Amino acid sequence: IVGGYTCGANTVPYQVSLNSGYHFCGGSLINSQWVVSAAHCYKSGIQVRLGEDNINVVEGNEQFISASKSIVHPSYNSNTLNNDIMLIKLKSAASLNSRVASISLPTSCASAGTQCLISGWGNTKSSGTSYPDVLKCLKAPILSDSSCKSAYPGQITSNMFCAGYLEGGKDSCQGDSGGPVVCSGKLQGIVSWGSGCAQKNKPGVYTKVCNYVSWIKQTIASN
Ligand SMILES: [Ca+2]
């Protein structure tokens, strides 16, 4: 997250870190057994880390649970990032508590102009590199479909939305991929892509979770 703030330990209790020896993407806990992330975050050998604040210090509230299954969307296209969504099943259910909690899936899609909370352990620099240890947060508004399409001509599908600030300075970034975009208390987006981070006229692009709720529900009813 570039231009964000330190969230505060465990104040985003549905945020997970995906670890394959190191943190490599975020995700969102949607119930005690299942995490939503980005398909472009797929790796074999994923451990889900819940209850994290500092990802480099064991502070006492974590749960580390291996994935048993990952399910990339059946129509994911890694070239365009259309349908950039994945489900990860935990080997054992998380113990839900004040610091480890699920986020609701949406009933309706979010509205342009809505301010959403984006979070993660990704790079904090637009130019260069610096990865935080503690979880960072950003409030960013959803942009209109037409502004998003103007920013990325020929690249935005109906399964994507843009959020952020066209003047630059505030965005998600590498390492935030797969993490949540929460709007009015619902998981509306997944950190997916963008050209650089926090650059002028290049806002973040997010997977539009409300298009996937029937897939998510049928998949979790069957696995
Ligand atoms: Ca930790």
Curated annotation (Swiss-Prot):
The keyword Calcium applies. Subsequent cleavage after Lys-125 leads to alpha-trypsin. Further cleavage after Lys-170 yields pseudotrypsin. A cleavage may also occur after Arg-99. The keyword Metal-binding applies. GO terms for biological process: digestion; proteolysis. Residues 1-221 form the Peptidase S1 domain. It is an enzyme of class 3 (hydrolase). InterPro entries: Peptidase_S1_PA, Peptidase_S1_PA_chymotrypsin, Peptidase_S1A, Serine_Proteases_S1, Trypsin_dom, TRYPSIN_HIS, TRYPSIN_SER. The active site is at H40, D84, S177. GO terms for molecular function: endopeptidase activity; metal ion binding; serine-type endopeptidase activity; serpin family protein binding. It catalyses: Preferential cleavage: Arg-|-Xaa, Lys-|-Xaa. Substrate binds at D171, S172, Q174, G175, S177. Its EC number is 3.4.21.4. Synthesized in the acinar cells of the pancreas. Interacts with SERPINA1. This is Serine protease 1. It comes from Bos taurus (Bovine).
